[PDB]
């Protein structure tokens, strides 16, 4: 996507601590962005809205969970499985 990059807190953030986990989930059926802590309605893509762009195909695993990174160089090196992948 590229935009919504002043986000990565409810979707990822550079979290580093000994244990201390607080994840949110209920039913596991096609988990395309089922966790997070912001607009989890999917609407535009899966946030407050969406620009005039559509990047959805058989390739991503968590609804571009790590797309709010600094522009489109790769991703955030904390936990998400993208970067050289998107």
CATH number at residue 55: 4.10.20.10
The technique by which this structure was obtained is NMR
31 is in an annotated binding site: no
Do 80 and 66 touch, CB atoms closer than 8 A?
yes
Enumerate residues preceding breaks in the chain (C to N > 2.5 Å). none
Residue 33 domain boundaries: 1-86
34 is in an annotated binding site: yes
* Alpha-carbon radius of gyration of the chain: 13
Rounded Cα gap, residues 24 and 43, in angstroms? 20
Q: Domain tally for the chain?
A: 1
Determine if residue 30 is labeled as part of a ligand binding site: yes
What values do phi and psi take at 36, rounded to 5?
65, 180
Instruction: Give yes or no for a contact between 11 and 63, defined as CB atoms under 8 angstroms apart.
Output: no
How many CB atoms sit inside 10 A of residue 4's CB? 22
Do 24 and 34 meet the contact criterion of CB atoms below 8 Å apart? Answer: no
């Amino acid at each position: 996507m590229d935009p919504v990059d002043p986000n990565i807190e409810p979707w990822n953030h550079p979290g580093s601590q000994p244990k201390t986990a607080c994840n949110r989930c209920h039913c596991k059926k096609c988990c395309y962005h089922c966790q997070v802590c912001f607009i989890k309605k999917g609407l535009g893509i899966s946030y407050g809205r969406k620009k005039r762009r559509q990047r959805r195909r058989p390739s991503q695993g968590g609804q571009t969970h790590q797309d709010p990174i600094p522009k489109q160089p790769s991703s955030q090196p904390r936990g998400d499985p993208t970067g050289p992948k998107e």
